[PDB]
Design an enzyme around this catalytic site. Structure first.
Site, PDB file in Angstrom:
ATOM      1  CG  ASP B  25      18.843 -27.201  31.059  1.00 13.01           C
ATOM      2  OD1 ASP B  25      19.434 -27.913  30.067  1.00 13.01           O
ATOM      3  OD2 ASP B  25      19.189 -25.786  30.845  1.00 13.01           O
ATOM      4  CB  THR B  26      16.232 -22.321  32.685  1.00 12.22           C
ATOM      5  OG1 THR B  26      17.256 -21.819  32.192  1.00 12.22           O
ATOM      6  CG2 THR B  26      15.900 -22.216  34.262  1.00 12.22           C
ATOM      7  N   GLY B  27      17.057 -24.310  30.153  1.00 13.70           N
ATOM      8  CA  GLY B  27      17.183 -24.362  28.763  1.00 13.70           C
ATOM      9  C   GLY B  27      16.763 -25.477  28.121  1.00 13.70           C
TER      10      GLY B  27
HETATM   11  C1  LIG Z   1      20.275 -24.853  24.606  1.00 11.59           C
HETATM   12  C2  LIG Z   1      20.552 -25.909  23.903  1.00 11.59           C
HETATM   13  C3  LIG Z   1      21.741 -26.572  23.804  1.00 11.59           C
HETATM   14  C4  LIG Z   1      19.322 -27.090  24.122  1.00 11.59           C
HETATM   15  N1  LIG Z   1      19.215 -27.816  25.400  1.00 11.59           N
HETATM   16  C5  LIG Z   1      19.704 -27.277  26.901  1.00 11.59           C
HETATM   17  C6  LIG Z   1      21.242 -27.264  27.083  1.00 11.59           C
HETATM   18  O1  LIG Z   1      20.955 -26.403  28.350  1.00 11.59           O
HETATM   19  C7  LIG Z   1      22.306 -28.267  27.131  1.00 11.59           C
HETATM   20  C8  LIG Z   1      22.327 -29.362  28.404  1.00 11.59           C
HETATM   21  C9  LIG Z   1      23.394 -30.265  28.357  1.00 11.59           C
HETATM   22  C10 LIG Z   1      24.843 -29.836  29.024  1.00 11.59           C
HETATM   23  C11 LIG Z   1      25.870 -30.930  28.989  1.00 11.59           C
HETATM   24  C12 LIG Z   1      25.858 -32.155  28.114  1.00 11.59           C
HETATM   25  C13 LIG Z   1      24.681 -32.426  27.499  1.00 11.59           C
HETATM   26  C14 LIG Z   1      23.379 -31.585  27.846  1.00 11.59           C
HETATM   27  N2  LIG Z   1      23.721 -27.567  27.098  1.00 11.59           N
HETATM   28  C15 LIG Z   1      24.499 -27.379  26.324  1.00 11.59           C
HETATM   29  O2  LIG Z   1      24.454 -27.900  25.110  1.00 11.59           O
HETATM   30  O3  LIG Z   1      25.497 -26.828  27.011  1.00 11.59           O
HETATM   31  C16 LIG Z   1      26.966 -26.646  26.345  1.00 11.59           C
HETATM   32  C17 LIG Z   1      26.938 -25.512  25.842  1.00 11.59           C
HETATM   33  C18 LIG Z   1      27.815 -24.210  26.657  1.00 11.59           C
HETATM   34  O4  LIG Z   1      28.426 -25.204  27.669  1.00 11.59           O
HETATM   35  C19 LIG Z   1      28.107 -26.542  27.265  1.00 11.59           C
HETATM   36  S1  LIG Z   1      19.518 -29.654  25.048  1.00 11.59           S
HETATM   37  O5  LIG Z   1      20.266 -30.297  26.125  1.00 11.59           O
HETATM   38  O6  LIG Z   1      19.939 -30.265  23.617  1.00 11.59           O
HETATM   39  C20 LIG Z   1      18.143 -30.435  25.449  1.00 11.59           C
HETATM   40  C21 LIG Z   1      17.153 -30.078  24.256  1.00 11.59           C
HETATM   41  C22 LIG Z   1      15.866 -30.857  24.249  1.00 11.59           C
HETATM   42  C23 LIG Z   1      15.462 -31.470  25.277  1.00 11.59           C
HETATM   43  N3  LIG Z   1      14.316 -31.892  25.419  1.00 11.59           N
HETATM   44  C24 LIG Z   1      16.501 -31.637  26.280  1.00 11.59           C
HETATM   45  C25 LIG Z   1      17.819 -31.071  26.585  1.00 11.59           C
END
Ligand SMILES: CC(C)CN(C[C@@H](O)[C@H](Cc1ccccc1)NC(=O)O[C@H]1CCOC1)S(=O)(=O)c1ccc(N)cc1
Lengths: 99, 99
Positions: B25-27
């Protein structure tokens, strides 16, 4: 272009003549943008993130330019902490992970 | 290797003799793994995303193997719906974004 990850992979996107900053997020299945006004009929939807579920507005077939690359797809608008481009649009511009 | 995004970028990771499925996860700025009893001292922390915040435990200097690639760094453990390998560890195995 090849993007390293020492910094947040942020890019300038163009949507509706407006220029916004968004994060290339391979962890998001969908594209979610901050509150804004988009034209067209939208449908209510709910997505789940790391901290729970939120309500969003779903817009279909929306044209979006990501660093000069055109994509046309679904865009969810709602209370996200930041604009994120998900796999639905990343695949359209041929984005891949390499290592 | 080259990973396309038609589907979630799931990979096998090794941590403490345990092998798990994790999302590249690049996000995600930092790595976040589902609950597990890791040894060592840790620090409480709150991280937020879509849906809000969750409380996690921060561990430092944790050895992790991502698809046969050696990496060592910070790891957040908490009630996450999905295991996520963030940029902190992605930069270590030289992962980039291409298009
Ligand atoms: C871009 C934002 C959302 C921030 N993060 C990355 C995202 O990739 C995050 C990953 C994820 C996927 C599925 C279930 C739970 C988490 N996906 C997300 O929300 O997916 C939704 C939006 C549309 O489709 C589904 S995070 O997870 O909050 C995060 C924050 C801080 C740390 N240290 C680690 C992780």
């Amino acid at each position: 272009p090849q993007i390293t990850l020492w910094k947040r992979p942020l890019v300038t996107i163009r949507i509706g003549g407006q220029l916004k900053e968004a994060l290339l997020d391979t962890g998001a299945d969908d594209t979610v943008l901050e509150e804004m006004n988009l034209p067209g009929r939208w449908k209510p939807k709910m997505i789940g993130g790391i901290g729970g579920f939120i309500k969003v507005r779903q817009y279909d077939q929306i044209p979006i330019e990501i660093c000069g690359h055109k994509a046309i797809g679904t865009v969810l608008v709602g209370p996200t902490p930041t604009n994120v481009i998900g796999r639905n649009l990343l695949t359209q511009i041929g984005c891949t992970l390499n290592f």
